[PDB]
Design a protein around this ligand. Structure first.
Ligand SMILES: [Ca+2]
Ligand SMILES: [Ca+2]
Ligand SMILES: [Ca+2]
Ligand SMILES: [Ca+2]
Length: 291
């Protein structure tokens, strides 16, 4: 019922000497909409949101370096690595201003880029995004020991790299409805070879939890500082119970952030796109027409 196909012609562009894959549809009339996925997804996660937006706006959805159909160089796949590649991807497309639609680690990339380039951002729609997590008590109990293991020396790489737990297990556990075997094939494909799973493991180790990694905590705090000042139009989707963003936090941010509307998508964990793609895509399209 929720679409499982990926009916988008591949686009490729060389970025720092590495080929990155992206979706590019819609009319080049006006401001393009840049969709940024997180862990462990790809542009596949936007496949049922894009068709609501492409009738009126150009839609661009890259696969992060080391993910999706993009090349897979020997990197640490730290956040800093993703910043370098995403900075250069956006410059390769010869764009000017954009609207961002961002999720999970794609939201850290998007917010950090918007803070450094605010004249180029005409709106941000965001969901289940990277915020500072003061203590492990704010991580959902049902996932807490596993994410602590992900961040434990030796233990975490055995789970994520050798056993592929983030794809086989954490991914479906971040979706309320069951994922199909075709959907799982699309998500599993980039990571069928264990040596290619480094980004799946480095990302949970980059989460800003209880002050560490200090560099991530600092950068995320700084773009949240910017978001609390900037007049940029903001659209916050949120679900219950969520994962990164509990309902109480969405409610706080909908009052504190300027020019922000919050949208309740109903039941949702992390991949809100997979539980209510039609509300998310439809409401982004309505919101775009008011900018
Ligand atoms: Ca090359
Ligand atoms: Ca650790
Ligand atoms: Ca299933
Ligand atoms: Ca602050």
């Amino acid at each position: 019922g929720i679409g499982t196909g990926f009916p988008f012609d591949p686009h490729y562009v060389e970025v720092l000497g590495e080929r990155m894959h992206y979706v590019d549809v819609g009319p080049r009339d006006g401001t393009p909409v840049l969709f940024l996925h997180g862990n462990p997804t790809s542009s596949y996660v936007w496949r049922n949101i894009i068709p609501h937006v492409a009738p009126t706006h150009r839609c661009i959805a890259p696969d992060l370096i080391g993910m999706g159909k993009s090349d897979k160089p020997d990197l640490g796949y730290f956040f800093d690595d993703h910043v370098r590649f995403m900075d250069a991807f956006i410059e390769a497309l010869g764009l000017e201003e954009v609207v961002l639609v961002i999720h999970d680690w794609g939201s850290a990339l998007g917010f950090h880029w918007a803070k450094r380039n605010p004249e180029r951002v005409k709106g941000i729609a965001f969901m289940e995004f990277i915020r500072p997590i003061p203590t492990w008590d704010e991580w959902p109990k049902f996932a807490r020991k596993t994410f602590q293991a992900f961040r434990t020396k030796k233990v975490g790489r055995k789970l994520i790299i050798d056993q592929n737990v983030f794809i086989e297990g954490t991914l479906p556990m971040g979706v309320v409805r069951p994922l199909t075997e075709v959907e799982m094939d699309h998500y599993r494909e980039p990571f069928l070879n264990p040596v290619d799973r480094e980004p799946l493991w480095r990302f949970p180790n980059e989460l800003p939890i209880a002050g560490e990694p200090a560099n991530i905590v600092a950068l995320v705090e700084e773009y949240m500082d910017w978001l609390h000042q900037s007049p940029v139009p903001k659209l916050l989707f949120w679900g219950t119970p969520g994962v990164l963003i509990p309902p109480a936090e969405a409610a706080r941010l909908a009052k504190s952030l300027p020019n922000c509307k919050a949208v309740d998508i109903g039941p949702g964990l992390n991949l809100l796109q997979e539980d209510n793609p039609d509300l998310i895509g439809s409401e982004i399209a309505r919101w775009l027409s008011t900018l």
